[PDB]
């Protein structure tokens, strides 16, 4: 979950490589998108949109292993400057768009890297962010130009508890090289099932494999499966995506002048041709 | 006043110069696309202009390059403009060239009296890409420091020499301060010159042979 | 109109020029005032302006600090390097890559010998040409995009 | 790293030119010549 | 971040023509 | 978009106007 990025990597959620630490636990793999505008003007509210899609009609395993639907979260870094715009600067139709959403700042004062989720998949399908652009004229040290935005969004449950031990959304391999005898199946009247399993004979050998309830099996009885061999099928239907994009804190005077200069040019070009036209004429008062 | 013209004329002979200019005629088949060359040219000079401009602020050293850029970006008067131009103008240039490579080929402009004018072109082109490449790394940021780290290996395949080549152009075994050094050299002094020689070829040859035939 | 003056098929020079592939700037509109001095500045000042505008609406970004221990994932030379890139990256014996790349410049030279057989400018009277040109061009664009895609999904461009 | 608006710009004109280029190989393949060759 | 590329292309291409005809026509409106 | 369009139109618009506008303008006071 979002907050555990926080909790295992404290200072930034994004590796030098571009990684994004989320990733680190969420080992699956699925499309993710941010849209922002192309330019925002200094000091405005604009929408910036995380898309984290999936087949809404589908469910993943839970702890015990029910088969409940699933939940999204993401982290979104906008550029130095950017913040979640003020409740009262959001105007209305946007306020509705944005929804019940818990925007949290990655660390105290990184007001521009925002955590989001868990938040439930069915309607948080995209996820809006009311964001308020900086002002290079009152923040002497915000500068105009174009800046990155890395998204890095995820849906469905993880593969590793911050503590270090496997979850159960994943597949469970094989403790041993060789031949199997018993596929047992505990259930200690609190922490649910446990299909256990054993292997043996070849190297002296007696040793065991407890495997949580969630996956299907695909294994049968007696197999000669070698160590760490696919014994479980694959529970996950969720996983992690990344995005990067570019937005442009545009000062308008630049545009304004530029526009001017575009006219000035149009206008000369006109003069030029016009001109040649007058000479296309005087020119023919000389072939006779 | 004093009659300036004549002044020159007595001495230098301004006059023939003017006639060589005014007497070159434009035929018929020469239609818009035969502006690509010139466009590519205009393109490049914009480079050269802004090129030089940034030579006054940019610092080719691995402690300094990356930041001077963002100086030029953030605190130099119109650096942002100036640097932004050098950037799109590079692109524009590589591309107007390709577009000109088209009008040559499908106008069969590159044929018997003129296979030199084409040969150069290729060279121009290899050089332009070169500017292009070297250029590209001087920011000594993440994206460009992986792209030198990438290509600079490539030649190591090539079998007697080929390392020596890489070593030549990276200035040691790994990438690093020599590389950038060498590269700034590249980019700001070698290619500016080479290009100009061969542009000069590419141009004379043309004033000499005139445009290619009609269709 | 325009303005225009015709060949001079009495000028035995123009002739022998024409003949060696070449008198072509001796007839047509004049290039002085006319082309050079009126419309050229239009092309220039035009060409300028687009870049200016291009530069100002979408100016030029700043990377992170290059780090020689972290490779970016997403890390692409510029555009007119895709084609080669594709080749280079996905052709698994290294000397072939080089070989194949140099072939671009080299080949591209040869052409006007190779294509020197007939005298024909027009891309129409040169079917076998215009074809190979077309073909090449595509394979180009294709490897092109191809470099934008991810390895495996690359050649197929994803669609087979 | 990658720059759409450029790339668009590129194909855009690559076709356009390719285009009009043959448009005039034709337009002339085909009402040819005159004044002498 | 793909809706531009597309956009670009359309205009980049299509505009040429507008300008083209714009030209052409100008030309009609004047006489030659 | 739609406003792109409009603005566009309206912009070329004008210039196109000022063109024609000025031939005649120039033309019929004998300048072309």
């Amino acid at each position: 979950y979002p907050f555990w990025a926080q909790q295992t990597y404290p200072p930034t959620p994004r590796e030098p490589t571009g990684r994004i630490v989320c990733a680190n636990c969420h080992l699956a793999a699925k499309p993710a998108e941010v849209e922002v505008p192309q330019s925002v003007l200094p000091d405005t509210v604009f929408k910036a949109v995380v898309k984290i899609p999936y087949d809404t009609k589908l469910q993943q395993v839970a702890a015990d292993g029910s088969k409940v639907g699933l939940n999204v979260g993401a982290v979104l870094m906008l550029p130095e400057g950017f913040k979640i715009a003020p409740e009262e600067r959001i105007p209305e139709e946007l306020k509705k768009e944005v929804g019940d959403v818990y925007f949290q700042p990655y660390k105290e004062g990184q007001d521009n890297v925002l955590l989001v989720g868990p938040l439930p998949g069915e309607q948080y399908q995209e996820i809006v962010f009311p964001v308020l652009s900086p002002n290079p004229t009152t923040d002497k040290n915000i500068h105009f130009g174009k800046y990155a935005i890395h998204l890095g969004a995820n849906r469905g449950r993880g593969q590793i508890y911050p503590t270090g031990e496997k979850s159960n959304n994943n597949v469970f391999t094989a403790s041993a090289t060789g031949t199997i005898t018993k596929i047992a199946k505990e259930e200690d009247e609190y922490g649910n099932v446990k299909y256990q399993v054993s292997i043996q004979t070849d190297s002296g050998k007696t040793v065991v494999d407890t495997i949580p309830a969630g996956p299907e099996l695909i294994v049968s009885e007696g197999q000669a499966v070698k160590a760490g061999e696919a014994l479980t099928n694959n529970p996950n239907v969720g996983g992690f995506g990344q995005d990067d994009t570019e937005i442009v804190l545009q000062d308008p005077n630049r545009v304004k002048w530029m526009i001017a200069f575009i006219c000035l040019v149009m206008l000369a070009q006109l003069m030029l041709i016009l001109k040649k036209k007058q000479v296309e004429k005087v020119q023919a008062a000389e072939m006779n | 006043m004093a009659n300036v013209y004549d002044w020159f004329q007595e001495r230098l002979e301004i006059q023939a110069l003017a006639d060589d200019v005014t007497s070159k005629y434009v035929p018929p088949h020469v239609n818009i696309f035969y502006c690509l060359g010139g466009i590519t040219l205009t393109c490049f000079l914009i480079q050269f202009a802004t090129g030089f401009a940034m030579t006054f602020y940019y610092k080719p050293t691995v402690t300094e390059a990356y930041a001077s850029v963002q100086y030029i970006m953030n605190e130099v008067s119109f650096g942002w403009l100036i640097r932004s131009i050098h950037r799109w103008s590079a692109s524009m240039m590589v591309l107007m060239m390709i577009l000109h490579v088209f009008r040559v080929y499908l106008t069969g402009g590159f044929k018997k009296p003129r296979e030199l004018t084409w040969i150069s072109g290729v060279i121009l082109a290899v050089i332009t890409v070169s500017f292009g490449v070297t250029g590209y790394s001087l920011p000594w940021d993440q994206v460009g420091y992986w792209a030198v780290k990438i290509v600079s290996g490539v030649p190591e395949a090539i079998p007697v020499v080929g390392v020596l080549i890489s070593d030549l152009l990276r200035g040691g075994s790994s990438v690093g301060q020599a590389t950038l050094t060498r590269y700034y050299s590249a980019h700001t002094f070698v290619l500016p010159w080479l290009i100009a020689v061969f542009m000069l070829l590419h141009f004379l040859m043309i004033r000499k042979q005139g445009i290619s035939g009609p269709l | 109109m325009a303005t225009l003056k015709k060949p001079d098929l009495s000028d035995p020079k123009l002739r022998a020029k024409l003949a060696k592939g070449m008198g072509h700037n001796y007839y047509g509109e004049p290039a002085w005032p006319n082309d050079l001095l009126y419309v050229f500045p239009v092309v220039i000042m035009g060409t300028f302006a687009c870049i200016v505008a291009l530069s100002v609406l979408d100016p030029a970004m700043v990377g992170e600090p290059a780090d020689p221990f972290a490779t970016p994932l997403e890390i692409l030379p510029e555009w007119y390097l895709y084609p080669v890139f594709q080749i280079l990256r996905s052709v698994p014996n290294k000397l072939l890559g080089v070989l194949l790349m140099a072939s671009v410049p080299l080949g591209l030279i040869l052409v006007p010998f190779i294509e020197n057989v007939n005298k024909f400018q027009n891309p129409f009277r040169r079917p076998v040409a215009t074809t190979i040109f077309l073909f090449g061009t595509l394979v180009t664009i294709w490897l092109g995009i191809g470099a934008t895609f991810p390895l495996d999904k690359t050649l197929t461009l994803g669609l087979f | 790293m990658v720059e759409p608006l450029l790339d668009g710009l590129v194909l855009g004109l690559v076709f356009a030119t390719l285009g009009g280029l043959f448009y005039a190989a034709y337009q002339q393949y085909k009402r040819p010549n005159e004044l002498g060759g | 971040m793909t809706e531009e590329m597309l956009y670009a292309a359309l205009l980049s291409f299509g505009l040429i023509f507008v300008g083209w005809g714009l030209g052409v026509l100008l030309l009609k409106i004047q006489g030659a | 978009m739609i406003l792109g369009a409009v603005f566009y139109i309206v912009f070329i618009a004008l210039f196109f106007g000022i063109a024609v506008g000025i031939i005649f303008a120039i033309k019929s006071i004998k300048l072309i």
């Binding site: 192309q38 545009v255 149009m266 | 818009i32 | 687009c50 | 005039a24 | 507008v18 300008g19 052409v24 | 566009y8």
Partner: peptide
């Protein structure tokens, strides 16, 4: 928040007006 648009626009207009003017200028391709 649409001087911004005028902005791209103007890029398009010159681009056009150019070709335009270029063709008009030499009765052109």
């Amino acid at each position: 928040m649409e001087i911004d648009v005028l902005g791209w626009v103007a890029l398009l207009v010159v681009f056009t007006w150019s070709i335009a003017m270029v063709v008009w200028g030499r009765n052109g391709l």
